[PDB]
């Protein structure tokens, strides 16, 4: 009838992954009654404007030849470095490849992806260049943006030696710095559920229609293989690329976070479901849904044109991973920041494993499965109230734990022992104008 | 601990979409905390026996040539008009194409569909003819039935400019009229969940096995492409066509509605799940599951015959749409009605959108996200009690709102403040014999 | 606010399918308001070491020729009969083919399956031999193990004549016997959710690249059909074959059951979800997920190598069925048992149908749909507490029904009328050392 | 606000709730000459609005008054340049943005 200590600890670590109070890790409060090992991955990366040695081409230049460094096209990217730039970070629920970084000369109208699969996507210290016309970049084209993936290798090693996994919590911090008199720019952040699934795209099979004139064995092989078949299955994310511009996100989502670039960001990625079942590790190629062009059978058409119906473009990322289902996708934009910026990315990903026999994880085991329905219900209720992000230095929220968690703990059903904890008022997270009020009306003076 | 006004309003509009009391629209009570636009589409159609100018062929006659009007085969359909006819209306959860109409000379044994994809399916004012032997109709065959789709164009336009959608409620009214002394016929209606999913059917790839006798370059290309592959993905509905006859539905479902044809019908389509998440618009080709013929690996067979295992026929409708998941499929039959009938179809579909930036929907925004768990639980509980349909004139039910909703509101858990509202007794919806009793035993005298 | 009699009866039959108290069958307590027929299938099989007449080859020997009996290779299997053997029984959620039996000369390191589809899988009285090198067996190879399927034909007949079905409960009993002074061996049993889904594997299409030298009609047909496409859809189970060894299961799952072989086993298969919706019968070919070998796009690779990404091996069973979703997969091992053993398998499967019109099931109808939320919540709560299996003779548990069900019935929410029923303590199911304590600390003296 | 034409897009987004409030209109007319022409970009969500300014201006219209005295209204000093800003009731406005 009351929340337990383990449930409260899990709630804290799930809502505030990078909070200083959260020191020890706790499992999902469902009493799974299995041997589990909880792993906490804390990583730090120092992203800035890349030098020429870290830039690689994605076009047909690097087709079978591995990554090709940029050759004196770096002058154009220096031209970028003359003015203010834009930096997007996209946190898909992929376990490896925690975030994807992108550098733009100026804010795009959408989060575009290339129709052709890129060659050798680069991991964080290296970047890969994409052309300005939304295509892969070969040397001698016009560079459009730079893209990189932030990779966690220990996660891969541990996922190999695990029978089941489940993501417990994830948080990304963006401590931003710049030279004095160059602290311009704005930061926006937003989470939203992009429920991916294993899908195949409709491709066209090449046909052999050949009315041959062979001497005597003229088969006249009209083998009409011009049929639509299904490509290989891929995990496809319904990421609305065309609506990922910062302004669109600010208008759409109420809990979106906006501030000055110097405030950085701190996004605790939240789940979208009340249950977190274990899943077997199953890496698969990732892809992102696009938009369809030919209406096809969306209008009264013939039988022949059913095949070219509404077919949504699938953008292959040339990256394989296993995703955490029902976890929100985060996206943050740094618009108009100085090209001499420096972003310290700090990611914390804590997730539970079921070790396989004779594996490394078996030596680090937590034999304490707890059960707490109240904590799960409270998290489900709080899902829609918490802001999508906070300033980078706004950890250790005072209002959390025994005020927010408590004041939200009697509402679930009537499972209540304490009559009234604290009335809950609508907070105003106006970080831009410094008029910030917490969940209980207490003002938040800037402590960082 | 008590239901709110917004929750009650949503419950009313979800259970009684076409009730006169429901004037303003309300969103789903889950506190989604997003910018939403609620659109209400009210449409009216006057269906009757079509003239020759509205009839089109579906066979190979209209293969690449567009729709072909019927040529003096209309005499057979007039022969239909000599006797009593049957009119089926099938409301699949498709957003566009709200219902599918069908006209039969006499009641069929099942809801059949053609194995070959029809050519140019026609929208309501126009119909398309299908042969009596369950195949597509070309001019000069024997007509079996007429089929049409009732299309909502504004829904398509608004779905284009939306990042996410969710169906809030849907209702279909069937006001029936006929010349005096021609009011014979019966009406049956039933809802049931047909949970569709994105599936591909197993097709056979055409192979090139050619032991050529070419002069010197005799490749002898035995390229055995006779492998089973997957067709394009389609949204397939497990609609039990063979069990959609009126008698089968009456025997199976207890809440099925039956009455005289003159009573018409009023079917509020109900959801089958307690949650209604937003979904991105993604039109896809629709299809209906059939039945398998070859048992295949349902018996001990060789490796070669695994490919021709139990493969269920997939009937392509040559229509693309995005469906509302977890919403019931409705089906109503008018059996033995006069051929000079007149059905006034009135559909009301209210659904919520997340507008994209710079779209039309953005100018019509409801910034009021409410949360009401009690209303959702009450709807889930009431799902199994409400009748599938009512007489066309039986709106504004007295027993709804503060008697049914209240008397069902204390049962969920124990979230109760009012001890006893009203004991609930099993109603008897015997519309045929006029002995109708409501949920609380109060008789229902015919007011229309 | 209190559990009903129907809810309690369903809980009893779901948690204790083979308990002597459970005599009459009851439906799922959700008030489905449909005509349903509940069928209870009780079957008994006497498994022992097979004679030569019941053994069949799986390799290319039985390719188009039906099952080939073993020819004097039975000497090697007699050599098996010289020493102690191992017997695995795997209960997948398939409705037909209730269990799969396997006989090994000695305990394997994993539950392996053949990459090539076996020919003519055999049903229980007949077995099929598989080679020691993890491949299909032809006459003249080295036999590795024997495999068989236990088939229920009445289930198939009734599933044919049903519009919808849902599994209510399933239990498997393993009464073990052996000659005196040959009662050695151990028995292990474990359940775990293996959530299957309809998936297609990525296969390679054979291409026709032919630069011909024909006289005048030299097409030079370079038709590069070397594209990856999707195979036929199959229901694939994520059964962790590599982690199904008895030791791995004992270490991983806390509720796993272990005892001496003479104790037998009694496994009530439990669901993993709180809802049990009806589903239309749809037999489909079954397969089991393997492990991937080529990392592919799990590392930065070229565009060409995206196709050979992480592709998980799919092991076709050459068996078609419709599965019960969200039901646990059971697995039991008899290690080191005498080769002259005798296992009496007793399966009880009770499941609900929605009869089609004019079918046999329509003559056996239960028109009593009940509703009980408390029973469903109690079952969901108890899912994680109940042991995975019991000794074969440990039916009719005293602690069940009004102690366990009651003492777990007030916890759901606060839907409580009886203040305190009985405090619940953690049981110790140490069947091996005879120190067994029930859910309330009462010792369990051996009654069988 | 729009009056949609029949069969137009606007017809699908309708508010059927016409309300009447003479006091609000009179209060707006009265306040027209008191409110500043502009504010600093970050000076939204004024504390003095709504139940202090609107209330304290709501009894003056005619004598349509039920609450005797809400709050005396003093002349504000919107000296944004010198940071000596006082609201409609003398409460200082410290810079929050």
């Amino acid at each position: 009838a009351v929340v337990t200590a383990a449930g409260l600890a899990w709630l804290r670590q799930y809502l505030n992954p990078m909070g200083p109070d959260t020191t020890s890790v706790t499992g999902y409060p469902d009493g799974s009654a299995v041997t589990t090992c909880i792993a906490d991955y804390s990583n730090t990366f120092n992203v800035s404007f890349p030098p020429r040695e870290a830039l690689y081409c994605t076009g047909s230049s690097s087709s079978e030849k591995p990554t090709l460094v940029d050759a004196d096209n770096y002058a154009k990217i220096d031209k970028w470095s003359n003015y203010d730039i834009t930096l997007c970070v996209l946190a898909l629920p992929m376990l490896r490849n925690v975030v994807m970084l992108r550098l733009y000369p100026h804010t795009p109208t959408a989060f575009a992806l290339t129709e052709q699969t890129p060659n050798f996507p680069q991991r964080f210290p290296n970047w890969s260049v994409y052309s300005a016309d939304g295509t892969r970049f070969n040397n001698g084209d016009e560079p459009g943006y730079l893209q990189s993936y932030v990779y966690l290798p220990n996660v891969d090693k541990h996922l190999s030696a695990a029978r089941g996994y489940r993501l417990l919590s994830r948080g990304i911090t963006g401590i931003f710095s710049a030279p004095a008199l160059e602290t311009q720019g704005f930061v926006t952040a937003c989470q939203y559920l992009a429920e991916g699934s294993i899908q195949s795209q409709s491709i066209k099979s090449d046909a052999v229609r050949s009315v041959t004139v062979n001497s005597d064995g003229t088969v006249k092989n009209v083998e009409s293989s011009s049929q639509t078949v299904s490509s290989m299955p891929r995990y496809v994310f319904p990421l609305d690329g065309d609506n990922c511009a910062p302004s669109s996100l600010t208008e759409t989502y109420h809990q979106a976070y906006q501030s000055k670039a110097t405030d950085g960001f701190y996004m605790p990625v939240l789940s979208s479901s009340r249950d977190n079942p274990f899943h077997p590790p199953q890496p698969r190629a990732i892809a992102v849904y696009g938009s369809f062009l030919a209406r096809g059978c969306l209008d009264p058409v013939s039988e022949a044109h059913e095949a070219d119906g509404p077919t949504h473009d699938i953008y292959r990322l040339n990256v394989a991973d296993d995703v955490a289902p029902l976890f929100n996708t985060g996206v943050v934009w740094f618009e108009g920041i100085s090209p001499k910026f420096s972003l310290k990315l700090k990611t914390r990903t804590v997730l539970q494993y079921i070790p396989t026999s004779g594996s490394v994880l078996a030596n680090f085991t937590r034999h304490e499965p707890t059960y707490d329905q109240i904590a799960l219900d409270a998290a489900d209720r709080l899902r829609n109230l918490m802001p999508h992000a906070y300033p980078a230095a706004y950890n250790d929220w005072g209002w959390l734990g025994d005020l927010l968690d408590s004041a939200i703990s009697m509402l679930p059903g009537v499972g209540t022992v304490y009559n009234i904890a604290k009335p809950l008022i609508k907070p105003a997270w106006n970080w831009l104008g410094n008029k910030v009020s917490d969940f209980f009306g207490n003002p938040v003076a800037r402590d960082g």
Side-chain angles (χ1 to χ4, degrees), chain A residues 83-141:
Chain A
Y83 323 87
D84 287 4
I85 62 183
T86 294
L87 168 74
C88 165
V89 8
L90 170 85
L92 280 173
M94 308 192 302
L95 264 40
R96 292 150 278 213
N97 312 298
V98 45
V99 302
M100 158 178 342
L101 300 166
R102 252 178 191 193
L103 261 181
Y104 289 91
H106 36 250
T107 324
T109 70
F111 193 91
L113 284 152
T114 67
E115 67 302 314
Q116 309 288 330
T117 321
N119 274 296
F120 298 91
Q122 291 312 301
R123 310 205 166 134
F124 159 61
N126 311 332
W127 302 67
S128 49
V129 195
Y130 292 82
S131 154
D133 49 77
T135 60
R136 290 170 320 171
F137 175 87
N138 301 264
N139 253 310
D141 302 334

Side-chain angles (χ1 to χ4, degrees), chain A residues 32-37 95 155-167 277-283 322 351-362 365:
Chain A
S32 270
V34 285
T35 281
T36 55
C37 155
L95 264 40
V155 177
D156 169 56
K157 285 138 87 155
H158 293 165
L159 265 174
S160 314
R163 154 210 318 267
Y165 77 90
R166 68 167 151 204
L167 182 61
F278 274 104
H279 281 127
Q282 266 200 69
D322 38 23
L351 83 176
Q352 215 172 2
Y353 294 124
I354 300 177
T356 77
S357 201
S359 70
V360 52
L361 300 178
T365 292

Side-chain angles (χ1 to χ4, degrees), chain A residues 31 38 60-61 72 111 155 185 206 209 277 302 339 352 388 393 397:
Chain A
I38 310 188
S60 93
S61 292
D72 81 79
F111 193 91
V155 177
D206 54 318
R209 55 280 319 281
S302 101
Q352 215 172 2
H388 286 167
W397 323 314

Side-chain angles (χ1 to χ4, degrees), chain A residues 39-261:
Chain A
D40 159 273
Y41 304 93
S42 287
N43 288 72
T44 301
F45 309 87
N46 280 279
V47 5
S48 55
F49 208 92
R52 198 202 60 106
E53 293 82 52
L55 263 40
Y56 292 112
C57 296
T58 55
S60 93
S61 292
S62 267
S63 38
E64 80 297 334
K65 180 49 188 154
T67 87
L68 300 193
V69 201
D70 266 35
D72 81 79
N73 287 244
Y74 193 61
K76 307 149 187 211
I77 315 180
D78 287 32
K79 278 177 239 164
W80 297 6
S81 94
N82 293 144
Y83 323 87
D84 287 4
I85 62 183
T86 294
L87 168 74
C88 165
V89 8
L90 170 85
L92 280 173
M94 308 192 302
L95 264 40
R96 292 150 278 213
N97 312 298
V98 45
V99 302
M100 158 178 342
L101 300 166
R102 252 178 191 193
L103 261 181
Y104 289 91
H106 36 250
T107 324
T109 70
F111 193 91
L113 284 152
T114 67
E115 67 302 314
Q116 309 288 330
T117 321
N119 274 296
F120 298 91
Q122 291 312 301
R123 310 205 166 134
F124 159 61
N126 311 332
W127 302 67
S128 49
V129 195
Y130 292 82
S131 154
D133 49 77
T135 60
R136 290 170 320 171
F137 175 87
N138 301 264
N139 253 310
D141 302 334
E142 181 61 44
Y145 59 92
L146 321 173
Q147 169 168 310
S148 149
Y149 292 88
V150 169
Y151 189 68
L152 311 178
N154 286 337
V155 177
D156 169 56
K157 285 138 87 155
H158 293 165
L159 265 174
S160 314
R163 154 210 318 267
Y165 77 90
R166 68 167 151 204
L167 182 61
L168 287 186
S169 93
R170 172 166 273 184
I172 303 122
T173 313
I175 292 122
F176 177 89
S177 34
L181 319 172
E182 281 233 299
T183 57
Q184 70 251 39
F186 294 96
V187 51
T188 306
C190 172
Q191 311 177 18
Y192 58 93
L193 175 68
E195 51 283 78
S197 35
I198 298 150
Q199 303 288 342
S200 322
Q201 69 172 146
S202 186
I203 58 173
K204 278 277 295 156
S205 183
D206 54 318
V208 285
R209 55 280 319 281
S210 162
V211 183
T212 170
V213 70
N214 194 61
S215 59
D216 48 285
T218 191
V219 64
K220 283 104 170 72
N221 178 229
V222 200
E223 230 53 64
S224 187
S225 293
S226 332
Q227 51 195 154
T228 36
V229 291
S230 269
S231 73
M232 56 150 32
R234 284 184 211 88
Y235 199 94
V236 198
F237 278 114
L239 175 95
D240 275 76
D242 316 340
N243 324 115
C244 270
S247 32
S248 313
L249 301 167
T250 56
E251 305 159 356
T252 292
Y253 294 92
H254 290 159
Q255 316 280 6
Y257 154 82
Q258 315 175 57
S259 197
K260 306 277 331 193

